[PDB]
């Protein structure tokens, strides 16, 4: 039930970065994790998502630019970016997606976030 | 294709009163919703994670119910420092969407 | 030893021959029907619709299990022990077939364990051959798992529910013997596709009809993971040798101003030296032969045999009591008809030919170029061929007539002893 | 000359008469089924669905076309006798086949006219022919208008659904075809399909007979997907001086034993011919019977004498099960075996006994209320009811006859030994 | 008075017994089918669809009324007057039921007036149903507030068209099951306050074969009235039913058998067969509408009582009469036409020509074989260690030829 | 024929007010009625709706604070307010819905309104 | 999710000419439609309330027809006292919807 | 395989104009033609469409004022406009709509348009 | 049927790769065309069913997609490739364009 930060910092336009949020404290190998963006002084927004099986899904605005991969064995989720633009200045969150059932075991957690 | 909109965008209130915040879905999202409380400088939290269930540690004053397209969450009595922004997200499709926001004050 | 040309004199016409095909050895295959599909990684989309599907299925699966247990056992497990009670020959064969199923219980258990978690609609393992079909898995993989990226879990769930309820409705019409055709069309289609590697490859259109009539037997139900195990016995059709089957029909026979006919079965058979009838109610007609689950021959009356083997004088006759028995027929490039009942103006409408009172039927060959029966004029065919008597063995086919004749006899001998 | 008053002394009851209807002549109409609809000025929105529809239809038509060519030719002046064996019921159909072939040229002309059209039903006479096109009505009013406001994809999916349903509805009885099926497809009813015919002057009972007539296939094209059918509507003429009745029998007593007089379910009279009638294939109407063919079948001589009033020639048999009634009232009174079932006059206590010799008791205006077992009734006053050795025993089981023959055989061996 | 042990020497084998159940008294209940649903408060949203539905229904209800009015009445109304015509015993019971319905008409009409307007799917005071009411009240009325009356009307029309299609299959008597299928309910739920609760799995099967009858159609408010007669099942005393099978019987290298009905009955001192075609089998009983017994030939009754010598026999014509059978731990078979082997496969046991059938006991030897196949026998079997003189034929041509022969015999004797 | 209205006025923001629209001239017991608003120099907007049976639908803007009612006996309608804001300064109208059929005896009516 | 939009927003014409106004529906709203006239300083009234039927008292100048998703109201000859805002009203759903409006010379 | 446009020019408000797109080099009676507009420094927009059979479809902005017609024999296409306004100043194009099939004989062509 | 496309503005150097995506509100099928519109010229046609190449257009252009998401890409850029590119949808008789995306 813990999530880590990594990579939050300043890069030049056109650069590339590697943000890693690491998880520990539950069965990570049976859940779908996704990323979420929050531009400063603006409403929330969605970035991408990855399921257990590496199928991958992306928001149009960032399609073809970013890559998402997950490490089930070590319980780690990593994000890499390329061809960065000016609009992508925000706070980035690593989150867990609820199952489509009413079982009381589901909790829901929210990463602390990086300020890149 | 799914869209969400919520009213009122802005609210006025006082301690002890009652406040109602709606969130209307363009299409049928079902019993798949979640309400987040976002305060300046802090990471968002989870209040009612299936439109019915109260997350552990949440105060009882937050009561939420509804279904289909229309949904609603209502507060019984306010706390002066609980006037934050509130969001209604949908997780029907692998690709989520949000609303606008509501400054309870 | 059938003399077709001679028989025409008494109105019996024998159709062209055909062979017979019989099945004596069967190929055994097993068909596991897992009724709960699997969704790969959909985050538990469809769980609620699966539960309702399970509740609906429990209505048709709990009674089925209870019926299986109440069934008696002819053999208790050299093949085995006889058991207590009465059982005939026809039941012992099924008992042996079911005993053979207990030998493959271990192998079937292995296959089920292997296919516990898998996404393939049709899958076969052969060390002994097994085949496993999973409910509507093809449709899921094709149009539901892809569907949850553009619509969401709600619309996908509704579609899945409609599909599963329709599947349940299609069930309960085969499981209300389960009939092979009902199973084939249910899941996807075909019968040559399920049993990919087998003898079904060498099957004509007529052969496939015979297999569809065979009935499958349920031999297990699980109730923990919802599954039904079926045993299918596909046939190996081998054509017999020195066997022929014909067809017989009769037409009116005139004796002294009245109508009679020679009563015979629908079909006649000749295998080796054995001449007798044959029923084809359960068999299938084909272009070159028949297909019969078991030998259809049944012994005919001796007089009937002497009649069919060329001895005309021994045929019996009865009275015509309806309009079902005809009065003319095209035998071979000609006509054979009762010219007394039906007119026989052949060459010209004015011209007429009368059958003498003594004779019973008229055979026209060549003799006159065109023939007209009642109002229609026909032309003979020269490529064909044809050529140009007391029965005294009358019978009656109604019990009342027999009873009155018997009463007459009883009265006659009483007159004698008195 | 059937007598209905005397036979009641023996338990035989004859119901009300009815007439006969038969179909001597027929009317021939050809019906072409064009399975491929036409979409007009739609810019080819239908394609990619008609092509798939054609692949599905290819599974049905090809087997059907192959079957036609394997059928033997009975007939080839109407024709030539051909080879092989065929009976009367075979030649009667051969004539229809030749008649269909003798009018093949004109049918070809009509198919040319409908090559490019969007009419659900079209007709001509020269031999009139009617032609229905798969789902043309539904296309024209729903799919073609739908393209403007929904798009080609939404319309295409709907067309696919409709065509799949139509294909499923085919092969339901096309894999004789029956006339009800054709009516059920593209919901029509017979009166609408053949407007210019004799169908107009048909009652409710007359339509049921037509719905039981088989329709046969005479040609399948395989290039433009079409099936040609040959319907034969009947002309019904009420025969004259013919009657049909119904017959029921009740228990008859002899020495505290039960018997009954066996008779067919129906009996008919036509001029000077008396005999039974089978009605299994016919349809019963309010005032007559509609029969494909004369159902009369000759009956035993003694039975004819029995139904003509000569009441001492009837046969009887032993009652074996409780399916022969023990009582039945006809007109203002009962006629029942009073030995078995108790009969009572006005009062429940009052009882009436049938003497040992009498078989059944006819009670008229004799008792103003009669009781059979528990229930009692009121004996209608406007009724027309008015107030014997059989000597012919019969058995209806072959075993019974076999033992009797065995006894005769033994007796005759003893006679000369 | 069946003697099972003795009969086995001839080939006849009798299965274990079973009881009988019969229905003598019925319980009458009334079913009213209101075919027009009521929409509570929707500003008449669906009136257009209902009128189309009404016009479609008038094609099915009008013919029904005309047929009913053309039905003759057996007795015109203690209990009534006889009427003019012809009616047998089987019609009088239906007439009495109809007269009872006629007497109840008054209260039926009062109840109809009470329920004229109401939204309940099933009522009880008797029981009344209303077309597609659950569907309406569950989704169509609530959905009017979200999808509008266009989409709501479209689905209502689809539903009513489907319901009409479902009808014209039940009414095209009426089977009770058809009706239970139309409305998704069991028989138990419809008549909860009745005796149907105390029924087993095999008893409900019998109640589904009885036929219901139509006794009223109104044609102003579209409705149909039905009369249902639920049975009361009481098991008879001292009545048993058996099952009989026969096997081949050797007589000088030719096959024969003993023809008997498929079932046999003994009730009190009455010995006879049973035609159970219409009856429904059970684990201990035979549920039958009427008494199935039918008198058997005297010789057969004597044979089944124990007199082996007067049983008749016939020839075997096809391969349908078996040649061996399991009886009790051992086999009885015609070993002349089917090779029988004792312990050793090579060892062969031949039934002497005189004997007809051979009875093993499992003490004769432990393992026995048939023409193929091997069985190892039961230790706890109950099996234990002759001219017929009555030959019959079952084909009329056979009989006619013998008749002709005797005819010629007398003709010769007269001289 | 006539649907008079009364009860309008100007109140302090956040108050409670009750408008009335009496009815006469026709049968009031089988006709849904709803209210329609009109901001000065703006397009007409729906408000709410009440059915014969008190179904009490509402519009999104004013849901949760408005309480409408009807009386089938006195032929009177009423509307109530609570927690008024500054966004509703418009003319309130009493209106009769239509029966969704082609009846030849149908008609319509519209009220005078309240300034508010 | 129903919406109603109409164009042209503003219109200028001359007496005796032809004026055509169209309302478009997002989805299929049905035959249920009404047309309104809004003169300043007056209570709104009705002209055609089912898209086909005309209320008594309306001159024969006004005529409308259509169905489904496209509706249009056209007037044969204008008159000077006919300058006002016009509206499109759906009563298919319990929740009523308007167009935004039209102005004429 | 070459479409030529003609007509169109400066006209004060309210006028009537008639433009023509001649065609040559390909079959004309098997295709659907539509007009597309582009205001200076703006995005392209649809105008109208006419089917082979004169079904006739229109856009909201110009509905009820335009009249497109065509002639099969002469291989010509025309557009008629009346009661013009100030927002209809743009370059007009005559185009061909693709057939809804994957055939190998479809080309697609555009004209040079008219200034208007 | 509303069609939207991003990125609206784009900055690229010679030789690089670029991807432009159009999205449709509803399902529009395989029916989509890509246009090139240089200032002061008549628009051309690049890919006229979302995959098929217009005769004479250089091989550098190729596009793929279906359903609701479509994408166009060019292997190597050029000095003459700077223009506004469009996505049209001809599903309904009534056509609808995107917004447009300058490439530089």
The residues in C 46-105 lying below 8 A from A, measured between CB atoms, are: 47-48
Helix (H, G, I), strand (E, B) or coil at C376: coil
Give the closest of D85, D89, D405 to C330, CB-based. Answer: D85
Distance, in Å, from the CA atom of D329 to the CA atom of E240, rounded to the nearest integer, reads 36
Give the closest of E144, E145, E150 to G29, CB-based. Answer: E150
Distance, in Å, from the CA atom of D310 to the CA atom of D300, rounded to the nearest integer, reads 14
Interface test with F, best of G3, G94, G98 (most F CBs within 10 A): G94
Contact E114, E125 (CB under 8 A): yes
Which residues, in sequence order, are bridge partners of residue D275? Answer: D268
Rounded to a whole number of angstroms, the distance from the CA of H57 to the nearest CA of chain D is 9
Contact C384, C334 (CB under 8 A): yes
Rounded to a whole number of angstroms, the distance from the CA of C159 to the nearest CA of chain B is 14
Q: Say yes or no for a CB contact (<8 Å) between F53 and E41.
A: yes
First to last CA, chain F: 25
Cβ neighbours of E326 in C, within 8 Å: 74, 82-83, 85-87, 92
CB neighbour class for F50 (10 Å; exposed up to 12, middle 13-18, buried from 19)? buried
Residues in CB range of D3: below 8 A, 6 or more apart: D307, D308, D309
Give the closest of G49, G87, G96 to F34, CB-based. Answer: G96
Distance, in Å, from the CA atom of E156 to the CA atom of E131, rounded to the nearest integer, reads 12
Contact D247, D266 (CB under 8 A): yes
The continuous run of DSSP H or E covering E333 comes out as strand E331-333
Cβ neighbours of I98 in A, within 8 Å: none
Contact D35, D132 (CB under 8 A): no
Contact H84, H14 (CB under 8 A): yes
- CA of E14: how far to CAs of C87, E247, E257, E261, E285, in Å? 10, 12, 15, 12, 16
**CA-wise closest residue to E372 among E339, E335, E346:** E339
The residues in D 290-329 lying below 8 A from E, measured between CB atoms, are: 318, 320-322, 325-329
**CA-wise closest residue to D383 among C153, B12, E75, C366:** E75
Distance, in Å, from the CA atom of D127 to the CA atom of D121, rounded to the nearest integer, reads 17
Name the residue of chain E whose CA is nearest to G94's CA. Answer: E145
Distance, in Å, from the CA atom of B77 to the CA atom of B62, rounded to the nearest integer, reads 9
In angstroms, what is the resolution?
3.2
Cβ neighbours of C376 in D, within 8 Å: 78, 95
Distance, in Å, from the CA atom of C132 to the CA atom of C111, rounded to the nearest integer, reads 9
Q: Say yes or no for a CB contact (<8 Å) between D300 and C404.
A: yes
Name the residue of chain H whose CA is nearest to G19's CA. Answer: H64
Q: Say yes or no for a CB contact (<8 Å) between E392 and D402.
A: yes
For residue C293, what is the DSSP state?
A: S
**CA-wise closest residue to C29 among C226, C200, C206:** C200
Interface test with F, best of B22, B75, B88 (most F CBs within 10 A): B22
Rounded to a whole number of angstroms, the distance from the CA of C190 to the nearest CA of chain D is 12
Rounded to a whole number of angstroms, the distance from the CA of I99 to the nearest CA of chain H is 7
CB pairs under 8 A between C and E: 104
Cβ neighbours of H4 in I, within 8 Å: none
Distance, in Å, from the CA atom of A59 to the CA atom of A54, rounded to the nearest integer, reads 16
Residues in CB range of G51: below 8 A, 6 or more apart: G31, G33, G34, G35, G64, G65, G66, G67, G71
Give the closest of E40, E41, E47 to F101, CB-based. Answer: E47
Which residues, in sequence order, are bridge partners of residue B46? Answer: B36
Contact status of C404 with chain B (Cβ, < 8 Å): no
- CA of I79: how far to CAs of A82, E186, I8, I82, I104, in Å? 24, 79, 20, 7, 9
**CA-wise closest residue to G8 among H39, H90, H65, H47:** H65
Give the closest of I33, I94, I100 to H43, CB-based. Answer: I100
Q: Which chains touch I (3 or more CB pairs under 8 A)?
A: A, D, H
Cβ neighbours of B20 in F, within 8 Å: 63-65
Helix (H, G, I), strand (E, B) or coil at H84: coil
Rounded to a whole number of angstroms, the distance from the CA of B80 to the nearest CA of chain F is 19
Q: Which chains touch B (3 or more CB pairs under 8 A)?
A: A, C, F
Which residues, in sequence order, are bridge partners of residue G70? Answer: G24, G67
The experimental technique used to determine this model is: cryo-EM
Rounded to a whole number of angstroms, the distance from the CA of D341 to the nearest CA of chain C is 29
Q: Say yes or no for a CB contact (<8 Å) between A60 and I23.
A: yes
**CA-wise closest residue to E214 among E103, E68, E73:** E68
Contact D385, D331 (CB under 8 A): yes
CB neighbour class for C133 (10 Å; exposed up to 12, middle 13-18, buried from 19)? buried
Name the residue of chain H whose CA is nearest to I49's CA. Answer: H102
Cβ neighbours of D313 in C, within 8 Å: none
Residues in CB range of D191: below 8 A, 6 or more apart: D199, D200, D202
Cβ neighbours of G94 in E, within 8 Å: 144-145
Contact C381, D82 (CB under 8 A): yes
The residues in C 154-193 lying below 8 A from B, measured between CB atoms, are: 154-155
CB pairs under 8 A between A and B: 46
Chains F and B touch (3+ CB pairs under 8 A): yes
Cβ neighbours of F55 in E, within 8 Å: 41, 145
CB neighbour class for H87 (10 Å; exposed up to 12, middle 13-18, buried from 19)? exposed
Q: Which two tokens stand for residue C400?
A: 């009342």
Rounded to a whole number of angstroms, the distance from the CA of F30 to the nearest CA of chain G is 15
| Count of other CB atoms within 10 angstroms of residue F25 | 10
- CA of D309: how far to CAs of B89, D5, D302, D389, G84, in Å? 96, 9, 11, 14, 100
Go through I55-87 and write b for each residue having 16 or more CB atoms within 10 A of its CB, e for each that does not: eebeeebebebeebebbbebeebeeebebbbbb
Rounded to a whole number of angstroms, the distance from the CA of H7 to the nearest CA of chain D is 29
Q: Which two tokens stand for residue C182?
A: 């009902």
Distance, in Å, from the CA atom of C334 to the CA atom of C387, rounded to the nearest integer, reads 10
Interface test with A, best of B55, B84, B95, B97 (most A CBs within 10 A): B95
Cβ neighbours of E145 in G, within 8 Å: 94
- CA of D278: how far to CAs of C261, D284, D295, I33, I96, in Å? 20, 12, 5, 75, 74
Name the residue of chain A whose CA is nearest to I5's CA. Answer: A60
For residue E290, what is the DSSP state?
A: S
Helix (H, G, I), strand (E, B) or coil at C55: helix
Q: Which chains touch E (3 or more CB pairs under 8 A)?
A: C, D, F, G
Helix (H, G, I), strand (E, B) or coil at F45: strand
Chains B and C touch (3+ CB pairs under 8 A): yes
**Residues in chain H, how many?**
116
Give the closest of E84, E89, E394 to D327, CB-based. Answer: E89
Name the residue of chain I whose CA is nearest to H111's CA. Answer: I42
Contact B26, I2 (CB under 8 A): no
Name the residue of chain A whose CA is nearest to I19's CA. Answer: A64
């Amino acid at each position: 039930v813990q999530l880590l930060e990594s990579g939050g910092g300043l890069v030049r336009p056109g650069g590339s970065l590697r943000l890693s949020c690491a998880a520990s404290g539950f069965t990570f190998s049976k859940y779908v994790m996704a990323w979420v963006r929050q531009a400063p002084g603006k409403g929330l927004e969605w970035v991408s998502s990855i399921t257990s099986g590496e199928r991958t899904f992306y928001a149009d605005s960032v399609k073809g630019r970013f890559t998402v991969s997950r490490d089930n064995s070590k319980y780690t989720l990593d994000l890499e970016m390329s061809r960065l633009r000016a609009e992508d200045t925000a706070v980035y969150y690593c989150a867990k997606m609820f199952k489509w059932d009413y079982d009381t075991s589901d909790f829901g957690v929210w990463g602390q976030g990086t300020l890149v | 294709d799914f869209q969400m909109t919520q009213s009122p965008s802005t609210l006025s209130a006082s301690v002890g009163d009652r406040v109602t915040i709606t969130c209307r879905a363009s299409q049928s999202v079902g019993n798949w919703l979640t309400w987040y409380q976002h305060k300046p400088g802090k990471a968002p939290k989870i209040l009612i994670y299936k439109a019915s269930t109260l997350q552990s540690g949440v105060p009882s004053r937050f009561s939420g119910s509804g279904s289909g397209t229309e949904f609603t969450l209502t507060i019984s009595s306010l706390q002066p420092d609980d006037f934050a922004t509130y969001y209604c997200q949908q997780f029907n499709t692998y690709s989520w969407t949000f609303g606008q926001g509501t400054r309870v004050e | 030893q059938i003399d077709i040309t001679k028989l025409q004199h008494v109105g019996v016409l024998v159709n062209s021959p055909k062979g017979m095909k019989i099945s004596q050895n069967f190929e055994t295959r097993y068909l596991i029907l897992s009724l709960i599909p699997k969704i790969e990684d959909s985050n538990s989309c469809g769980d609620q619709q699966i539960k309702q599907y399970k509740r609906l299925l429990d209505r048709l699966i709990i009674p089925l299990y209870d019926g299986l247990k109440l069934q008696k056992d002819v053999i208790v497990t050299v093949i085995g022990t006889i058991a207590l009670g009465v059982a005939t020959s026809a039941q012992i064969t099924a008992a042996v077939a079911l005993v053979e199923a207990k030998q493959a219980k271990s192998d079937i258990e292995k296959l089920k364990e292997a296919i516990r978690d898998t996404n393939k609609a049709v899958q076969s393992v052969c060390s002994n051959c097994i085949v496993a079909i999973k409910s509507v898995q093809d449709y899921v993989n094709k149009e539901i798992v892809p569907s949850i990226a553009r619509l969401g879990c709600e619309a996908a769930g509704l579609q899945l529910g409609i599909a599963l309820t329709q599947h349940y409705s299609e069930l309960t019409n085969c499981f209300g013997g389960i009939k092979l055709q009902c199973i084939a069309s249910l899941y996807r289609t075909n019968i040559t596709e399920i049993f990919t590697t087998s003898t079904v490859d060498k099957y004509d259109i007529y052969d496939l009809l015979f297999t569809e009539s065979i009935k499958v037997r349920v031999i297990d139900v699980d109730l923990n993971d919802y599954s039904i195990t079926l045993q299918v016995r596909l046939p190996l059709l081998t054509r017999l040798l020195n066997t022929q089957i014909y067809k017989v029909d009769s037409i009116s026979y005139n004796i002294q101003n009245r109508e009679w006919y020679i009563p015979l079965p629908s079909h006649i058979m000749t295998k080796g030296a054995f001449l007798g009838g044959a029923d084809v109610k359960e068999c299938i007609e084909a272009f070159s032969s028949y297909i019969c689950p078991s030998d259809p021959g049944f012994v005919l009356n001796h007089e009937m045999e002497s009649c069919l083997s060329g001895n005309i004088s021994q045929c019996p006759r009865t009275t015509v009591t309806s309009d079902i028995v005809p009065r003319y027929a095209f035998v071979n490039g000609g006509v054979v008809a009762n010219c007394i009942t039906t007119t026989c103006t052949c060459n010209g409408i004015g011209n007429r030919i009368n059958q003498p009172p003594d004779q019973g039927v008229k055979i026209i060959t060549k003799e006159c170029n065109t023939i007209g029966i009642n109002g229609m004029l026909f032309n003979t065919n020269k490529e064909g061929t044809l050529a140009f008597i007391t029965l005294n063995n009358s019978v009656a086919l109604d019990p009342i007539d027999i009873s009155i004749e018997l009463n007459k006899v009883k009265s006659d001998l009483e007159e004698s002893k008195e």
